[PDB]
Symmetry: C3
């Protein structure tokens, strides 16, 4: 029986942002959504988020996350950020006065924390019957973290903040994860003896360690070897660091499952993208949102995709694209732009310097050069000539061949098997199997250059 509190009420000063810290993203999810997903998995009885300026967030919690995760998540308010000890107090008010379960406390700013780390904490805390168990790690650069102070016997004495004591002695490398389990009555008790006479002048949660030690209670510290699972984010340097470690691990999972990623350091893959066996991802690539790739694909160099579905055996090279689908064996790129609502059928082709927006394109159809296709629908085994524009719902049949430089002034229907001359402005329906034209005839004006440009190419018309 446990209640979990997420502390998300701080000002996030060092982010230098008008966006609340806990809303800052990595791998496709805000830090708060990473944290709330880990806990939901653990499925505790009670789950509580402590908010300050409550409206720019209260909305995303529950409103997007408790429904999605299919559980209740309570919001508790802390009006002024008096400290992590004061934040816990406010979290406790959402529990009944007679609450008897355990209390787990975590920060909204530790995004790699996972269910398992949380479940072992709870299990250690029960196993040793502790008043407080705290997760610790060891780090080469310990700055900003509260340091674990141990007695002569390796007993946890206290936690000391960066700003406070450990004067010169900050050299300590065993750090506080900011992740705890507590007996409730020992928690209510220690919090009532908190004072704010310290370098930050705040009610620190960390002080509770030394206070329960004084009442000869049991304090257990529990070392997490994989430091990244408990790393904090207080600034944008630490954010990009952890984003990058999370990326390495998501890439590694895909590799081990049968995906060749040529260059992991420049391959960004959101948590949620799926990618099938034997596809190849070339450097300089981001796969974002709910993107899905089948097997045997080539994801070429310099491709950005957000919510794009790509079937088996398709090629997607230097493409910028979102909210679109690309069929089996289709070819896309290089230098191609897909806007939302693009659907390209199996074995379809979108070539170099082509943009498609809100359009349907049938199996084995080809748009290879320098063309814009918007709000149009196109059948199968058709061919759209180079340097053309769908001007905006235009309907094009199957096995159509349109000429280079045709303009389609919406709405127009071009029948199956129809053709269009090069340089045609199409303004009316074209029956099946007709040829549509508008360009006037070629007229050659002899010796024009000798007369009108008497230098350069004037030799050699000579």
């Amino acid at each position: 029986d446990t209640a979990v509190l997420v502390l998300a009420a701080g000002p996030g000063t060092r982010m230098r942002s008008d966006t609340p810290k806990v809303l800052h993203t990595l791998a496709g999810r805000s830090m708060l959504s990473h944290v709330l997903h880990a806990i939901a998995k653990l499925a505790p009885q009670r789950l509580i988020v402590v908010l300050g300026h409550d409206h720019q967030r209260i909305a995303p919690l529950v409103g997007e996350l408790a429904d999605t995760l299919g559980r209740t998540i309570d919001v508790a308010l802390q009006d002024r950020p008096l400290g992590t000890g004061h934040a816990v107090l406010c979290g406790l008010s959402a529990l009944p006065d007679d609450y008897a379960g355990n209390v787990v406390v975590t920060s909204g700013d530790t995004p790699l924390l996972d269910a398992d780390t949380l479940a072992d904490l709870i299990a250690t805390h029960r196993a040793v019957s502790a008043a407080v168990t705290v997760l610790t790690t060891t780090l080469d650069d310990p700055f900003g973290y509260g340091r674990i102070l141990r007695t002569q016997d390796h007993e946890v004495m206290a936690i000391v903040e960066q700003t406070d004591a450990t004067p010169s002695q900050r050299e300590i490398r065993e750090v506080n994860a900011g992740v705890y389990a507590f007996d409730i009555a020992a928690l209510r008790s220690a919090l009532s003896r908190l004072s704010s006479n310290n370098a930050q002048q705040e009610l620190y949660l960390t002080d509770v360690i030394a206070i329960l030690r004084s009442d000869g209670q049991t304090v257990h510290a529990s070392h997490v070897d994989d430091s990244a699972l408990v790393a904090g984010v207080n600034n944008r340097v630490q954010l990009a660091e952890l984003a990058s470690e999370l990326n390495r691990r998501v890439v590694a999972a895909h590799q081990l499952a049968g995906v060749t990623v040529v260059d992991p350091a420049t391959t960004w893959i959101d948590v949620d993208v799926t990618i099938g066996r034997d596809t190849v991802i070339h450097p300089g690539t981001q796969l974002l949102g709910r993107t899905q790739i089948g097997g045997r694909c080539v994801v070429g160099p310099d491709t950005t995709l957000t919510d794009v579905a790509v079937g088996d055996g398709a090629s997607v090279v230097r493409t910028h694209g979102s909210s679109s689908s690309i069929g089996d064996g289709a070819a896309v790129g290089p230098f191609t732009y897909l806007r939302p609502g693009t659907a390209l059928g199996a074995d379809g082709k979108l070539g170099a310097f082509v943009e498609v927006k809100n359009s349907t394109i049938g199996t084995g159809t080809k748009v290879p050069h320098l063309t814009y296709v918007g709000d149009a629908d196109i059948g199968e085994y058709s061919n759209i000539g180079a340097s053309s524009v769908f001007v905006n719902r235009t309907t094009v049949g199957s096995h159509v061949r349109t000429g280079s430089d045709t303009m389609f002034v919406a709405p127009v229907t071009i029948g199956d098997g129809a053709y269009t001359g090069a340089g045609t402005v199409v303004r009316e329906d074209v029956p099946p199997g007709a040829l549509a034209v508008s360009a006037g005839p070629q007229r050659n004006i002899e010796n024009w250059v000798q007369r009108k440009r008497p230098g350069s190419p004037a030799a050699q018309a000579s």
Copy 2:
């Protein structure tokens, strides 16, 4: 007198691939082709590759590599993958029963191994008169490697596999390279006493170390400090790692020879690309295949080239290109696509949003904007107007100036010094020094917008 065996018969389970492991590529060559190139250099008397599912490969060996390397390479078959000890046995059947030379054994999955490492092995093995010499290295992460066990006196006792013994004690960091020299009779002998009662239930080559130790033979282990030269690839994580270390070294060689590479971490250069003094390679660049760059070039950001020859003093910026040539002082990019058979002469120019396919383009000719050129040939000091298309063999002369938006419906010949109006559809030959036109005349319809769009721009026609 030595015979070299390459073991390439395993199932490659952890690659999760329908492509045989040994065919997986890095820096432009399969692991098997890296390995076979190193040995060819050493030039042993006999060279033997052990294959299993023999047809998807037997083809590339000899068929591409023994001819290319100009030596004989024998294939020996091992039908079922009973173990690296069973693989060696099958390799031995390609040697005469009375064979008396030394036997070198290596894996098809150690691609950075070089002639020199191999030559020192053979020399140590002769020098110390050993029954077996084995190459070892030391590693921070030793997982998957067989561990070297040494007596109290640093004598090699045995090799132990990851799956087997070293229970907790796997902490050992001295690893087996999988690269050996053997006396033949001691090799035939130890292999005949191999059993498969082990965690994998296989006939391990590694066991031969302990067996010859038991017959008080000489076992020499030889430490390779540069660990990368003997690193194995069992999965796609290890593949991308080693691909990346090989890349760093190929980049470093080019830098030391007089090439500025702005960002090595994002510059991929195949082994085989040549690059001349004082050129500059900007970030996000891959130079692949048999690509060649002269001196004083700029290789701009985000350029991909496969089998592209670029002369001195040329510029190639954000270009995607293959099987093509670019003359001295030519400018290409940004946002340019070259398809096979593109030849651009000295001081030529292909600009932004231009594609060229199977075309010849003469010295000092310019195609700067938004145009497609396919299966066409073009003389010197000509100028192809923006937003044009060569529709498919078209022939264009020297000092031609064609108008913006001209369509060339193949086959058509445009004489030297000829011009074309803007918006011309060219369907017939254009004599030298003629002007070709087809666009009809401008007609202005006054106050059209007041009448037909009574809002917006209707003020201010006001």
Copy 3:
């Protein structure tokens, strides 16, 4: 009272370059300009640069840097590169014979050295009253550096060059920064006893350490913990290394000030670029020269900008651009090319496959597709149709709407609120609120395909 000498007279052999080593760039400035900027800040009384082949440089010093830094910088000549000790001698000739200040000596090839490191050196040198103080650091890879040799008591004895002594014993990891302070008379004195009997056969500055030790003078060595501030560049491998460390630090400064940089390892930012709070820089991006970004911008993936000003809240995605301005809330990209003299007004739009050169574009104007705009000026809330070309000063009014595939043959004036049909060649002024057209009428030729292509699309016109 100090005089500072920069030694820049060497041949730079290992750069394998026809460009003098000291002119090689990182983060937007030559190594010499990094070095001269650090010293200028310190503001010494005298500042002297030692040059050899004097003309390819003497020009940039003073000529660009002493004016810019608003101080005098003297050039002293050393005709042949006899050594760093001989270089100092030549530097001294630019001081009066009776000069009595201190003498600071540094290399033109240590580009991260900063004013502060220099000011603490001078202060240590005064504080301890030393004859020579030398800056040292400690390094994992010590190759090419002169090693600090200390007595049994940690007293600096001598400096030994890589090429010379420390035979096997080169294992020493405490290195010479090449940055010194000297008493002038002790400097004149030690230099007069220099000989060139050594592995390089040169007059080494380093020998002066041992010589003043012999005259029982005071030799102080001063350890710099941040090794990068005193790292040298003798080859292009070391150059790209230090360029990359300088980049990491410039990125970090921007992050800590309120800029999200998704991927630091692939974000190049010149020293001098300014970037405002809450903007987001996506991977694969270079911001170069005097580029300026406001707040709330998105700098999308694969953007290169050199001297580009971007206001607040603008979007710049996969754009290659230079010497141009982009207004507040404007959208640019993806796949856009800006050439010098491009000015786009607030809330303007340049879309995919658009190039703009030397053009003015007013507030809320839109050029979204496949168009070239050169030497043209365009008012506000206008719309330039897809696949169009400004052919070269063309003037376009406000609230104009031009049709897809319009060619504007410069010089032409299009009045406010005017329209243009699709496929129009505009050769004469268009009054305000007129419609301009030239395309002829659509003609449909029935059953053409059955007759002229009797296969394929011939079914199904069937």
